[PDB]
């Protein structure tokens, strides 16, 4: 009857008149309509013509919060997410007394939080993320009657984290991350949030110790206290987090040992306590938990990686680099898990690489630099086509590289530097369609550079210095137009450079020093547009230095210890070039000690 | 690290049609495996090689955090804006090669703090003002090219500048001095 009539369409026409609508999101809002229910963003639950939800997210709407919308009596859900809503959020938002969901995230809202948000008794979900709100969190926020989600992430809140937020009994998610809060301790009272499933306090300028109270949060699923200045130990109390799946404590000043009590966390799958000052050994009890991801990099950890970690059927990520860990990697690592990212670099690990790291066919990153690993690359890795980044440098590895390993189709970086690797580069290198950086320096590699290296059109770096490579440069090498670095110094390369060098238009560094190259430096040397570093020293290059060299703007030139003859172009007869032409008996220039 | 953070700051203020900075992943421990970046044995940046990459945009003062950088190669691009004063903090720089760009404003007097600089090529820009006298204090300077700018005022002929010839200061708006052969007021 009369009792149940409304002016919802009229209220909504006032919302429309109060907002800039450049993309005409509100054109459907036609006052000739019998009902606003069909309007863009509008839903009316029941046959009743009462508006129950307004979702204007991502509409490109601008202007202040339209407080007139509170005159919609049955409005339970309002979203202005991802708009240009601006100015202060008015204290008269509390007039919206039926609101269960309020999402004003990703807007240009400014000033202080209106304390009257606490005076909407029906409010379950409050999201103010990605706004410009500042000042203290109001004391009224301790009095929310039914709030389950409080999200104030990515604002300019500059007060201390309030203990009264622990007084919201119904709260399931406390998300305060990325606020320039005044340095504050985690309030012990947050342990009284018995229904809490998410505590997200990343980059909140938190200080002091993690309180033992937090162990009382039996329903917590995400504890995230990362990017803070928390000190003290990871508490053994955290073993009381019965339902926890993810613990993030990275980039803090935490000390002491990883508590074995983390082993009691049956649902724990992700733990990252990286970038701390943790000491002692990784506990076997934690490794027995079937973790999806364990990151403990840049700590002061010692001892052995427990073999139990290789039992997890869920492990895809282990990053424990920058520690003093010793012994062998678990023999069965990768055998029972889809390992994707392995980084054990900057450790004192030794022995052979585990044979089956890529058994499940998902390994992308193999990063083991600065360890004492020995033996041959496992033959299985030749079939690991998922790999994109390979860093085996600064180990004690020996033997041939498995044929197939050179041809992996998605590898972008292959770095075998500072090992005792032997044998040749296989013709299989042709299959490496994604290879950009090839770094083989300081090995015992032998043989000619295969012609298939020229098929690597996207190759940017070829560094193979300090090896026993031999033969003339393959003709295909000069077809590499994306090459910026060619370093073949300290090898046994022989033969002549050809006119094909003119195709190295992107080459910055040409280092062919300490080789057995013969013939003349090609006149096309001056046609290399971005060449700034040229080292042809310690070869048998003969003939006149090309006049084209004067075209280049080199920061480094050395043609010393060759069979070069003739006169120095007067531009090279400068004191700065005094150590660039040494050991060329035929060569006569106007430099002191030359000719 | 800090050095990678500083270069990533350059990536985001630079316009990169050819995606030459794609490998510049700021989640890497350091920028040493980044294409166009060369590091020393201590994993510290000594070279940035970005010549003729069709880069547009402005440089950042954050480049001055690279304390071991020796070769800054940003030549043959369309980079606009001023030479950040903070480039004078690059204590180990040997080469400053900003030539063939659209750089405007004055040559920072801070550049005279580069005591190891040997190559200074700022030619083919829109640079204005006088050539800082502090440049004469770089005893290591061997190559200078300030030609094809809009520079004016006295050209120094003392310290490192005594050896320099007219081709170094050619095609400037109103340069005066002994090298110019036009005496100054």
């Amino acid at each position: 009857g009369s009792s149940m009539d409304n002016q919802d369409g009229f209220i909504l026409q006032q919302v429309k008149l109060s907002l800039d609508d450049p993309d005409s999101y509100l054109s459907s809002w036609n006052s000739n309509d019998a009902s606003p229910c069909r309007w863009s963003g509008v839903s009316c639950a029941g046959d009743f013509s009462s508006v129950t939800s307004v979702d204007l997210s991502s509409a490109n709407l601008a202007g202040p919060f339209p407080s007139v919308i509170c005159r919609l009596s049955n409005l339970a859900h309002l979203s202005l997410y991802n708009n240009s809503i601006n100015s202060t959020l008015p204290l008269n938002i509390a007039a919206c007394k039926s609101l269960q969901t309020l999402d004003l995230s990703q807007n240009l809202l400014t000033g202080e939080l209106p304390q009257t948000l606490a005076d909407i008794p029906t409010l379950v979900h409050l999201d103010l993320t990605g706004n410009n709100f500042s000042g203290d969190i109001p004391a009224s926020f301790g009095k929310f009657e039914n709030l389950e989600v409080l999200s104030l992430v990515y604002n300019l809140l500059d007060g201390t984290i309030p203990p009264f937020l622990g007084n919201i009994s119904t709260l399931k998610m406390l998300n305060l991350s990325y606020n320039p809060f005044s340095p504050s301790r985690i309030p012990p009272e947050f342990g009284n949030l018995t229904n809490l499933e998410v505590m997200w306090l990343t980059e909140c300028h938190l200080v002091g110790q993690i309180p033992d109270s937090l162990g009382q949060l039996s329903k917590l699923v995400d504890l995230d206290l990362a990017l803070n200045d928390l000190v003290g130990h990871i508490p053994p109390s955290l073993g009381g987090l019965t339902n926890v799946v993810q613990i993030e404590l990275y980039n803090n000043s935490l000390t002491g040992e990883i508590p074995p009590e983390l082993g009691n966390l049956k649902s724990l799958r992700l733990l990252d306590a990286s970038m701390n000052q943790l000491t002692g050994k990784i506990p076997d009890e934690l490794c027995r938990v079937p973790l999806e991801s364990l990151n403990l990099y840049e700590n002061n950890l010692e001892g052995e990686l427990p073999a139990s970690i290789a039992l997890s059927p869920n492990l895809y990520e282990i990053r424990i680099f920058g520690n003093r860990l010793t012994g062998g990697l678990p023999k069965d690592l990768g055998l029972n898990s889809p390992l994707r990212w392995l980084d054990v670099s900057e450790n004192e690990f030794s022995g052979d690489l585990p044979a089956d790291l890529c058994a499940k066919g998902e390994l992308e990153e193999l990063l083991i630099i600065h360890n004492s690993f020995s033996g041959v690359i496992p033959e299985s890795l030749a079939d690991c086509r998922s790999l994109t980044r390979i860093r085996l440098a600064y180990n004690r590895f020996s033997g041939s590289v498995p044929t197939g390993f050179w041809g992996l189709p998605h590898v972008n970086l292959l770095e075998l530097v500072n090992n005792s690797f032997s044998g040749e580069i296989s013709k299989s290198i042709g299959g490496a369609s994604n290879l950009s950086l090839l770094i083989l320096s300081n090995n015992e590699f032998t043989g000619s550079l295969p012609e298939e290296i020229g098929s690597l059109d996207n190759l940017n770096q070829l560094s193979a210095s300090g090896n026993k490579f031999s033969g003339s440069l393959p003709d295909s090498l000069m077809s590499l137009g994306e090459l910026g670095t060619l370093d073949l110094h300290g090898n046994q390369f022989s033969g002549e450079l050809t006119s094909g060098i003119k195709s190295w238009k992107k080459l910055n560094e040409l280092n062919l020093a300490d080789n057995e190259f013969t013939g003349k430096i090609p006149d096309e040397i001056g046609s290399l547009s971005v060449l700034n570093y040229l080292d042809l020293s310690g070869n048998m290059f003969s003939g006149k230095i090309p006049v084209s060299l004067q075209s280049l703007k080199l920061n480094q030139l050395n043609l010393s210890y060759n069979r070069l003859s003739g006169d120095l172009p007067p531009s090279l007869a400068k004191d700065m070039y005094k150590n660039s032409f040494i050991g060329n008996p035929g060569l006569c220039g106007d430099i002191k000690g030359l000719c | 690290n800090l050095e990678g953070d500083a270069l990533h700051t350059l990536r985001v203020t630079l316009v990169d049609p050819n995606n030459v900075l794609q490998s510049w992943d700021p989640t890497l421990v350091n920028p040493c495996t980044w294409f166009h970046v060369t590091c020393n044995n201590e994993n510290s940046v000594i070279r940035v090689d970005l010549g003729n990459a069709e880069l547009s945009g402005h440089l950042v003062p954050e480049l001055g955090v690279l304390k071991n950088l020796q070769y800054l190669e940003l030549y043959s691009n369309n980079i606009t804006g001023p030479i950040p004063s903070n480039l004078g903090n690059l204590t180990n720089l040997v080469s400053l090669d900003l030539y063939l760009n659209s750089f405007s404003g004055p040559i920072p007097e801070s550049l005279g703090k580069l005591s190891k600089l040997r190559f200074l090529r700022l030619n083919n820009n829109s640079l204005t003002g006088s050539i800082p006298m502090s440049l004469t204090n770089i005893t290591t300077l061997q190559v200078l090219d300030l030609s094809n700018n809009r520079l004016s005022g006295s050209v120094p002929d003392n310290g490192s500048f005594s050896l320099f010839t007219p081709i170094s200061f050619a095609n400037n708006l109103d340069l005066c001095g002994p090298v110019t052969s036009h005496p100054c007021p």
């Binding site: 991801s293 990063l367 | 421990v29």
Partner: peptide, 14 residues
């Protein structure tokens, strides 16, 4: 739109 990093593991790698 200021994109907000999700709650999750750090990604530093060699």
């Amino acid at each position: 739109y200021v994109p907000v990093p999700a709650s999750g593991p750090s990604r530093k790698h060699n």
